[PDB]
């Protein structure tokens, strides 16, 4: 998790519309989701716990978790999901099961850039972030 710590600003997004469409996100929310460019703040809480916070004009969302420990998450579009985050060969692997679809998120860091790949069924989205601090 150490590679992911800090603040990251979203620069570009591709395919997020298609992800939201597949997940059943409603029209108004999708309009918002396609516009916003969130920050992502990843913090070490000690004791193996971490927080991810996402700030945007839509809302602030966050979650605190330990690696390899299933937890309840609410997504930004207000689905209740069962989530599980691990790190494997440098890749943060974050699954979200909403009981209809499983969303697979992979985050990777190379230098100043964090790339978040989001997959639902065959749909692929990539969101690229730059390091702020
Ligand atoms: C901040 C905009 C929220 C818009 C609502 C979209 C809800 C779809 C949820 C997809 C799961 C979360 C994807 C996070 C990807 C990332 O870290 O950039």
CSV table of C-alpha atoms and ligand atoms in Angstrom, one decimal:
chain,number,residue,atom,x,y,z
A,1,UNK,CA,0.0,0.0,0.0
A,2,UNK,CA,3.0,2.3,0.5
A,3,UNK,CA,3.2,3.1,-3.2
A,4,UNK,CA,-0.4,4.4,-3.2
A,5,UNK,CA,-0.1,6.8,-0.2
A,6,UNK,CA,-0.7,10.5,-0.8
A,7,UNK,CA,-3.0,12.7,-2.8
A,8,UNK,CA,-3.8,12.1,-6.5
A,9,UNK,CA,-5.8,14.3,-9.0
A,10,UNK,CA,-7.8,12.7,-11.8
A,11,UNK,CA,-6.5,13.9,-15.2
A,12,UNK,CA,-8.4,11.8,-17.7
A,13,UNK,CA,-11.0,9.1,-17.8
A,14,UNK,CA,-12.1,6.7,-20.6
A,15,UNK,CA,-15.0,4.3,-20.6
A,16,UNK,CA,-16.5,5.3,-17.2
A,17,UNK,CA,-19.8,6.0,-19.0
A,18,UNK,CA,-19.9,2.4,-20.2
A,19,UNK,CA,-19.1,1.1,-16.7
A,20,UNK,CA,-21.9,3.2,-15.1
A,21,UNK,CA,-24.4,2.1,-17.8
A,22,UNK,CA,-23.6,-1.5,-17.1
A,23,UNK,CA,-24.0,-1.1,-13.3
A,24,UNK,CA,-27.4,0.5,-13.6
A,25,UNK,CA,-26.4,4.0,-12.6
A,26,UNK,CA,-29.3,6.4,-13.4
A,27,UNK,CA,-29.2,9.1,-16.0
A,28,UNK,CA,-28.8,12.1,-13.8
A,29,UNK,CA,-26.0,10.4,-11.8
A,30,UNK,CA,-24.2,9.3,-14.9
A,31,UNK,CA,-24.2,12.9,-16.2
A,32,UNK,CA,-22.5,13.9,-13.0
A,33,UNK,CA,-20.2,11.0,-13.0
A,34,UNK,CA,-19.0,11.8,-16.5
A,35,UNK,CA,-18.3,15.4,-15.6
A,36,UNK,CA,-16.4,15.1,-12.3
A,37,UNK,CA,-12.6,14.9,-11.8
A,38,UNK,CA,-12.1,13.7,-8.3
A,39,UNK,CA,-9.1,13.7,-6.0
A,40,UNK,CA,-8.1,10.5,-4.3
A,41,UNK,CA,-6.4,10.7,-0.9
A,42,UNK,CA,-4.9,7.5,0.5
A,43,UNK,CA,-3.7,7.5,4.1
A,44,UNK,CA,-2.0,5.0,6.5
A,45,UNK,CA,-4.1,4.8,9.7
A,46,UNK,CA,-1.7,2.5,11.5
A,47,UNK,CA,-2.2,-1.1,12.6
A,48,UNK,CA,-2.7,-2.3,9.0
A,49,UNK,CA,-5.7,0.0,8.4
A,50,UNK,CA,-5.9,2.4,5.5
A,51,UNK,CA,-8.4,5.0,4.3
A,52,UNK,CA,-9.2,6.1,0.7
A,53,UNK,CA,-11.1,9.4,0.4
A,54,UNK,CA,-12.5,10.8,-2.8
A,55,UNK,CA,-13.4,14.5,-3.0
A,56,UNK,CA,-15.4,16.1,-5.9
A,57,UNK,CA,-18.2,18.5,-6.6
A,58,UNK,CA,-20.6,15.5,-6.3
A,59,UNK,CA,-19.7,14.6,-2.7
A,60,UNK,CA,-16.9,13.4,-0.4
A,61,UNK,CA,-16.8,9.6,0.0
A,62,UNK,CA,-14.4,7.5,2.0
A,63,UNK,CA,-13.7,4.0,3.3
A,64,UNK,CA,-11.4,2.6,5.9
A,65,UNK,CA,-10.3,-1.0,5.5
A,66,UNK,CA,-7.6,-3.6,6.1
A,67,UNK,CA,-6.0,-5.7,3.3
A,68,UNK,CA,-7.6,-9.1,2.8
A,69,UNK,CA,-10.5,-8.3,5.1
A,70,UNK,CA,-14.0,-8.2,3.5
A,71,UNK,CA,-15.9,-5.0,4.3
A,72,UNK,CA,-19.2,-3.2,3.6
A,73,UNK,CA,-18.9,-0.3,1.2
A,74,UNK,CA,-21.3,2.2,-0.2
A,75,UNK,CA,-20.4,3.2,-3.8
A,76,UNK,CA,-20.7,6.9,-4.9
A,77,UNK,CA,-24.0,6.0,-6.7
A,78,UNK,CA,-25.3,4.5,-3.4
A,79,UNK,CA,-25.1,0.7,-4.0
A,80,UNK,CA,-24.4,-1.4,-1.0
A,81,UNK,CA,-21.5,-3.7,-1.9
A,82,UNK,CA,-19.3,-6.3,-0.3
A,83,UNK,CA,-15.7,-5.2,-0.9
A,84,UNK,CA,-12.2,-6.7,-0.6
A,85,UNK,CA,-8.9,-5.0,-1.2
A,86,UNK,CA,-5.5,-6.6,-1.5
A,87,UNK,CA,-2.2,-5.8,-3.0
A,88,UNK,CA,-0.5,-8.2,-5.4
A,89,UNK,CA,2.7,-7.7,-7.4
A,90,UNK,CA,2.3,-3.9,-6.9
A,91,UNK,CA,-1.4,-3.8,-8.0
A,92,UNK,CA,-4.1,-2.7,-5.6
A,93,UNK,CA,-7.0,-5.1,-6.3
A,94,UNK,CA,-10.3,-3.8,-5.1
A,95,UNK,CA,-13.5,-5.8,-5.8
A,96,UNK,CA,-17.0,-4.6,-5.2
A,97,UNK,CA,-19.9,-7.2,-5.3
A,98,UNK,CA,-23.3,-5.5,-5.5
A,99,UNK,CA,-25.1,-8.9,-5.9
A,100,UNK,CA,-25.8,-8.4,-9.6
A,101,UNK,CA,-22.4,-7.3,-10.8
A,102,UNK,CA,-18.9,-7.5,-9.5
A,103,UNK,CA,-16.8,-4.5,-10.2
A,104,UNK,CA,-13.0,-5.1,-10.4
A,105,UNK,CA,-10.8,-2.1,-9.8
A,106,UNK,CA,-7.0,-2.3,-10.3
A,107,UNK,CA,-4.8,0.6,-9.2
A,108,UNK,CA,-1.1,0.8,-10.3
A,109,UNK,CA,1.5,3.5,-9.7
A,110,UNK,CA,4.4,4.3,-11.8
A,111,UNK,CA,6.3,7.4,-10.8
A,112,UNK,CA,3.9,10.4,-10.6
A,113,UNK,CA,1.0,8.5,-12.2
A,114,UNK,CA,-1.7,6.3,-10.8
A,115,UNK,CA,-3.9,4.3,-13.2
A,116,UNK,CA,-7.2,2.9,-12.1
A,117,UNK,CA,-8.6,0.2,-14.4
A,118,UNK,CA,-12.3,-0.5,-13.7
A,119,UNK,CA,-13.9,-3.6,-15.2
A,120,UNK,CA,-17.5,-4.8,-15.1
A,121,UNK,CA,-18.1,-7.9,-17.3
A,122,UNK,CA,-16.2,-7.1,-20.5
A,123,UNK,CA,-16.4,-3.3,-20.1
A,124,UNK,CA,-13.1,-1.6,-19.5
A,125,UNK,CA,-12.5,1.9,-18.1
A,126,UNK,CA,-9.2,3.6,-17.3
A,127,UNK,CA,-8.9,6.7,-15.1
A,128,UNK,CA,-5.5,8.3,-14.9
A,129,UNK,CA,-4.4,10.4,-11.9
A,130,UNK,CA,-1.3,12.6,-11.3
A,131,UNK,CA,0.4,12.9,-7.9
A,132,UNK,CA,-0.3,16.2,-6.0
A,133,UNK,CA,1.7,15.4,-2.9
B,1,LIG,C1,-17.1,10.9,-8.2
B,1,LIG,C2,-18.1,10.5,-9.3
B,1,LIG,C3,-19.0,9.3,-8.9
B,1,LIG,C4,-20.0,9.0,-10.0
B,1,LIG,C5,-20.9,7.8,-9.8
B,1,LIG,C6,-20.3,6.5,-10.4
B,1,LIG,C7,-20.5,5.3,-9.7
B,1,LIG,C8,-19.9,4.0,-10.3
B,1,LIG,C9,-19.0,3.3,-9.2
B,1,LIG,C10,-17.8,2.6,-9.8
B,1,LIG,C11,-16.9,2.1,-8.7
B,1,LIG,C12,-15.8,3.1,-8.2
B,1,LIG,C13,-14.8,3.4,-9.3
B,1,LIG,C14,-13.6,4.2,-8.7
B,1,LIG,C15,-12.6,4.4,-9.8
B,1,LIG,C16,-11.5,5.3,-9.4
B,1,LIG,O1,-10.8,5.2,-8.3
B,1,LIG,O2,-11.2,6.3,-10.2
